Structure 1
Amino acid sequence: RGNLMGKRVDFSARTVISGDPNLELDQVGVPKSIAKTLTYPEVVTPYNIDRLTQLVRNGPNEHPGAKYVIRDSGDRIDLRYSKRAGDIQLQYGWKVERHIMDNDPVLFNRQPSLHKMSMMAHRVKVIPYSTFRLNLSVTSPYNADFDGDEMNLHVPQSEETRAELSQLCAVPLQIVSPQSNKPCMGIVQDTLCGIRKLTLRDTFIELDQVLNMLYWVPDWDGVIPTPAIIKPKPLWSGKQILSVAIPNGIHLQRFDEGTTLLSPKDNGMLIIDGQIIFGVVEKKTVGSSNGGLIHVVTREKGPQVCAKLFGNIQKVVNFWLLHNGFSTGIGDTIADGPTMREITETIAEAKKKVLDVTKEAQANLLTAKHGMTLRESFEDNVVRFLNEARDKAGRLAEVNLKDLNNVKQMVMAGSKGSFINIAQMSACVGQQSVEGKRIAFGFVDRTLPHFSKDDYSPESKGFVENSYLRGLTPQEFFFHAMGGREGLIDTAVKTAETGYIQRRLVKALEDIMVHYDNTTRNSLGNVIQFIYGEDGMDAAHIEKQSLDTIGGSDAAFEK
């Protein structure tokens, strides 16, 4: 297991990673110190010799350089310590161990390697700092974060291996993932929030900013788009400028909820010939989702064009957002005074409902359905009451939040946040649960020594009427800590069991390959499937489409 299936390897590197908005999706930022350490063996040809000699003259101490020269005899000339490091006269067929240079195939990896996406080929770009740099839209396949994560880099040593990395493992190829038959990369974080802000009909751009954004797109045609508004002042829309990033010939049609062809609320999406007709751009349009811009552009234009689309969109949106600004404060968690009154009244009515159900149960007037304890019925009813209370208070809060509220902005764009976050921060965090039940009596008939015995009230069993803004009480805080400990245990313990499961799954199906007769066989030749997936289709080239004959009435079918 430890020396044959896996082993430590040469020509490897590893370091902390941060992200770079100005790096390309398939590119990786490699520190100079790493570049001067890792070498590629390059055989001198008439094509490369004039460069190679220079590198060997440039020396191993400064990049682009080289560290070793291998003669025909197999002797290695060390350029660090050699009296002949100066007068080297390269002969054809010799090998030069050149420094790793820009646009060189490497394999980039993050060690929880659950995906083939976890190891992807990248184009080297050498950088002046100690961290690995990578594009934001490539974080998702690696599950990468910049809170301190370290990533690893491997260097091919033969041209065949470089071809394998560039023709199979390249990042643009892996855009459409075979699992889930959808793209795995998309527009995230600042780019996504800014793209929603930019696509708004209210967003208008002046001539100077328009020109700078147009130049910012690397493949700009130089044709300044005709401004949407002309006479009172030449005003472009954000959609117009962003349409420059969209390649010509791209058509995207999506209808959302109540979307007319007049799109009154700017919902939905219509794009014709790489120009957006209506709608606000958000996670649906430009995320990893099926039928998004990434899937459509990869299928129609090709993986390379989509990979460049990532960078073009990022440049435009990041520039506009930098000059627009975005922020979040405690003011984004405050709810109106009347809204807070209504939230507390919702909590109080839920408390009254719980109390009345309890008084009913104590009177033995409750009747439990078949297969359920009377106490089980009581528990289910109280839990449902309190969960409904939390959800209703949170919805009150979210309706109260204005469009300028930045948490609501991030949720609308889809860059971060959820409804439950708004509810817990602004209205109340609700009921805490351990092992599927409310907090129990660790003490005799009491959850805490501060309560009376045989107390079943919501606050006694771990209901937090307080939002994170209001602040948890002592008992609420202890109950919440009890709840969170369970999640910490689940992380630290689940990981091992899921890893064991994945190892067994991989060892069970490792030999399963599609042979040249379209069958799916194991090492011994036994047929697992006579055709892969029973349709013979690679999972990446597959999208959900509707079968129009199956649905509807017979009359509509006839028509």
Structure 2
Amino acid sequence: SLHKMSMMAHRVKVIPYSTFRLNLSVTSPYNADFDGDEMNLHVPQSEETRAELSQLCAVPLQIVSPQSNKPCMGIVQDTLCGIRKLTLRDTFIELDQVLNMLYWVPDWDGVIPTPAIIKPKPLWSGKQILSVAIPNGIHLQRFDEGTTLLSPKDNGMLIIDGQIIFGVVEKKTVGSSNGGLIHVVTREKGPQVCAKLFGNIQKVVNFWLLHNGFSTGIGDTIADGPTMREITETIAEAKKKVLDVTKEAQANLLTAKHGMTLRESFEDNVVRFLNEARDKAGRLAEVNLKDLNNVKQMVMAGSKGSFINIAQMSACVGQQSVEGKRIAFGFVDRTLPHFSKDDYSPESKGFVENSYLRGLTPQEFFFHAMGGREGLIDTAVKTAETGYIQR
């Protein structure tokens, strides 16, 4: 336990099949994935202690983190992906599915909202059905970067009276954020309604995700031929720039950048070039990537992944690192015994040009191992020192 959370109270529902069991939203305050972690229980023994435990340490009156004035809860991976999937203009629901979803919402008042279309057919929009879980009298605006009140890119957010009007639901709305929906409802309506809000949203999005299905695989990671070719030539011209700089340096005419020594300037220039190459290639892969790509779906859907993750899986790994300087000559005059002496070409000193799809040439594999080892040992020392200073 490190901060005010991780002692929070709960009500108990007895379940079979021995293990504990808790809601997915409360996972990150506990900081506990299910990789084999373990919790602790503490039963109070009297009326005073039961009362003060229920009135202070219960979860629902601890949504807003006192340490950083934004809620610490939120909805997470599966329901986040499912809620972006459900809130799109391009999707629709028919009658039997919407009846089952409406019955899944527990406090549902028993009125079926009229569908958006009677068109020849009754169909409801995902925004429309999801508005049932949102309680009434709530208002919110986003207006980010598009949003001309006729939002063509469908970015932004707007709710009138518990009804979505436009906008793709996203972590910037329903995850933990400053102007988040969770923040708004807890501050406004009352800080135990929000618990029922999580229950409703989680149940309905989980049901619809069951009957839609979502997955990913290799073909997400693979790229397209011409884009791959452009990636290759981009890295090639970066290598050409590096070689040009090395020639200039070896011809002893350089600007000798101010504040820095000659070799420092050379190293700065080459590292700058290589990182620009990696960024450009990763951007190229991402802007090629199709809208049906699932890792793209998750990464613009909030929950997992990153731009750099996509770039490294598909386009290029990039230059490995050992405290800022790249891999030093442990062997005399060379990095590793498979090259002649006195090189500074990036593949010799450690630029993993390749990508995780194609795999690594063994030298690049070794340099990758170097970088990872550095990260591990840094973690293993910082944890003990930060624990002492915290105490």
Report the TM-score range of the alignment, normalised by the length of the smaller protein.
Answer: over 0.9
Render the CA deviation track for 1:516-541: whole Å, top value 9, x for unaligned. Answer: xxxxxxxxxxxxxxxxxxxxxxxxxx
State which of 163, 179, 186 in structure 2 corresponds to 1:275.
163
- Aligned to 2:375, the other structure's residue is in SS state helix
> Whose helix proportion is higher, 1 or 2?
2
What is the CA deviation profile of residues 124-158 of structure 1, one whole-angstrom value per residue up to 9, with x for unaligned ones? 11111222111111011111101111111111112
Helix, strand or coil: the match of 1:177? coil
Secondary structure of the structure 1 residue equivalent to 2:348: coil
Query: Shift in Å at residue 423 of structure 1?
Result: 0.2
| SS at structure 2 position matched to 1:126 | strand
Residue 235 of structure 1: how far off its partner (Å): 0.7
CA distance in 1 between partners of 2:211 and 2:21 (Å): 24
Structure 1 stretch 118-127 or stretch 308-317: which is displaced more? 118-127
The Cα shift of 1:368 comes to 2.0
Match of 2:389 in 1: 501
Q: Distance in 1 between matches of 2:174 and 2:356?
A: 33
> Equivalents in 1 of 2:237, 2:64: separation in Å?
50
Q: Provide the C-alpha distance between the structure 2 equivalents of 1:399 and 1:145, rounded to a whole number of angstroms.
A: 33
Q: Deviations over 1:90-126 (max 9, x none)?
A: xxxxxxxxxxxxxxxxxxxxxxx11111211111111
Deviation (angstroms), 1:231: 2.3
Rounded Cα–Cα distance in structure 2 between residues aligned with 1:156 and 1:413 = 42
The 1-side partners of 2:250 and 2:82 are apart by 57
Once the two structures are superposed, what CA deviation does each residue of 1:206-245 show, in whole Å capped at 9, x if it has no partner?
Answer: 0000000011011001110110111221110000110001
| Counterpart selection for 1:301 from 173, 183, 189 | 189
The count of corresponding residues between Structure 1 and Structure 2 is 391
Aligned residues with identical type, % of pairs: 100
Q: Deviations over 1:371-425 (max 9, x none)?
A: 2011111111111111111111111111111111000000111110000000000
Structure 1 residues 226-275: Cα deviation after superposition (integer angstroms, max 9, x where no partner): 10111221110000110001010111111111111001111000011000
How far 1:196 sits from its partner (Å)? Answer: 0.2
Shift of the alpha carbon at 1:339?
Answer: 0.5
Other structure's SS at 2:203 match = helix
Cα distance in 2 between the residues matched to 1:161 and 1:357 = 72
Aligned-partner Cα distance in 1 for 2:383–2:224: 42
Partner in structure 2 of residue 284 of structure 1: 172
**Unaligned runs of at least 5 residues, structure 1:** 1-112, 503-558
Question: Matches of 2:80 and 2:96 in 1, distance apart?
Answer: 23
| Cα distance in structure 2, aligned partners of 1:299 and 1:393 | 44
What secondary structure does 1:193 align onto? helix
Is residue 2:17 matched to residue 1:129? yes
Residue 369 of structure 1 deviates from its aligned partner by 2.8
Deviation at 1:330, TM superposition (A): 0.4
Query: Gaps (5+ residues) in structure 2?
Result: none
CA distance in 2, matches of 1:118, 1:337: 50
Which is richer in strand? 1
Q: Hey, what's the Cα distance between the residues in 2 that align with 1:470 and 1:426?
A: 9
Q: Does 1:188 align with 2:76?
A: yes
User: Which stretch shifts more, 163-172 or 416-425?
Assistant: 163-172
After TM superposition, where is structure 1 displaced by more than 4 Å over at least 4 residues in a row?
none
Following TM superposition, by how much is the alpha carbon of 1:311 offset from its aligned partner in structure 2, in angstroms? 1.0
Shift in Å, 1:450? 0.2
Deviation, 1:169, is 1.0
2:33 to 145, 148, 154: 145
Q: Distance in 2 between matches of 1:230 and 1:130?
A: 50
C-alpha distance in structure 2 between counterparts of 1:474 and 1:167, whole Å? 60
What is the alpha-carbon distance in structure 1 between the residues aligned to residue 373 and residue 94 of structure 2?
53
| Residues 439-470 of structure 1: per-residue CA shift (max 9 Å, x gap) | 11110011100011111111111111111001
Q: TM-score, normalised by structure 1?
A: 0.69
Q: Does 1:168 align with 2:56?
A: yes
Query: Considering only aligned residues, what root-mean-square deviation do their CA atoms show, in Å?
Result: 2.9
Q: Hey, what does 2:286 align to over in structure 1?
A: 398
Deviations 1:38-72 (A, max 9, x none): xxxxxxxxxxxxxxxxxxxxxxxxxxxxxxxxxxx
Offset, 1:346? 0.8
Q: Does 1:423 align with 2:292?
A: no
Cα distance in structure 2, aligned partners of 1:454 and 1:281: 55
The Cα of 1:329 is off from its aligned counterpart by 0.5
Q: Which residue of 2 aligns with 1:358?
A: 246
| 1:491 Cα deviation after fit | 1.7
Name the CA distance, whole Å, in 2 between partners of 1:166 and 1:272: 34
Hey, what's the Cα distance between the residues in 1 that align with 2:44 and 2:374? 44
